[PDB]
Design a protein around this ligand. Sequence first.
Ligand SMILES: Cn1oc(C(=O)Nc2cc(Cl)cc(C(=O)NC(C)(C)CO)c2)cc1=O
Lengths: 39, 156
Amino acid sequence: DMYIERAGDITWEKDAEVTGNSPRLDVALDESGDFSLVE
Amino acid sequence: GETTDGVYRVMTRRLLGSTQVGVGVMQEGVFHTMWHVTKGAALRSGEGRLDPYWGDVKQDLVSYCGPWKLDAAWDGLSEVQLLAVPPGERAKNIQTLPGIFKTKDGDIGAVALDYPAGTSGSPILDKCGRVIGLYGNGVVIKNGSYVSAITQGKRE
Ligand SMILES: Cn1oc(C(=O)Nc2cc(Cl)cc(C(=O)NC(C)(C)CO)c2)cc1=O
């Protein structure tokens, strides 16, 4: 059986760790909700 | 049981010990998570029970106790924060600038951050703190890196 536990508030934090890139990818979404790369 | 607005972990006792399968957002008395996290199954919250109300495998979304409430959208320009809730670790905001998933049916925002599968359902936030989507359905590129879509549902 699955259950939920509170993990925190939904707020924006000023001066948070800024990381990660912004790639532009050609993708395909199948009928099962799965994404795949199209090249 | 617990109907307070906020971010929640989704746990199971079926495997060894307590395992985190995903994360979700409680807002306006409705629990929002990714379909692949629960597979549409009922949830427990203290003495209370949450039953599913709406869901769609292709969108990979599910709402509990009521219809989908999250409607805010990415503006296409600004940086966002992933409010990541990793398994066994504290909730942490990671700011990033989203990329784009180009599909034959339109472009969608994408977040390029590496987190374990049990982090699926973690909300993505705008500068006002509004949930613009959920993290945890995407693709694994070239070196084993993960890129998730910015998955938002439709408010009726
Ligand atoms: C089942 N099923 O799972 C998914 C899905 O998107 N899983 C998932 C989600 C996340 Cl947030 C991360 C990773 C992941 O690979 N993590 C590392 C640590 C290995 C690399 O960052 C995987 C869809 C789906 O139908």
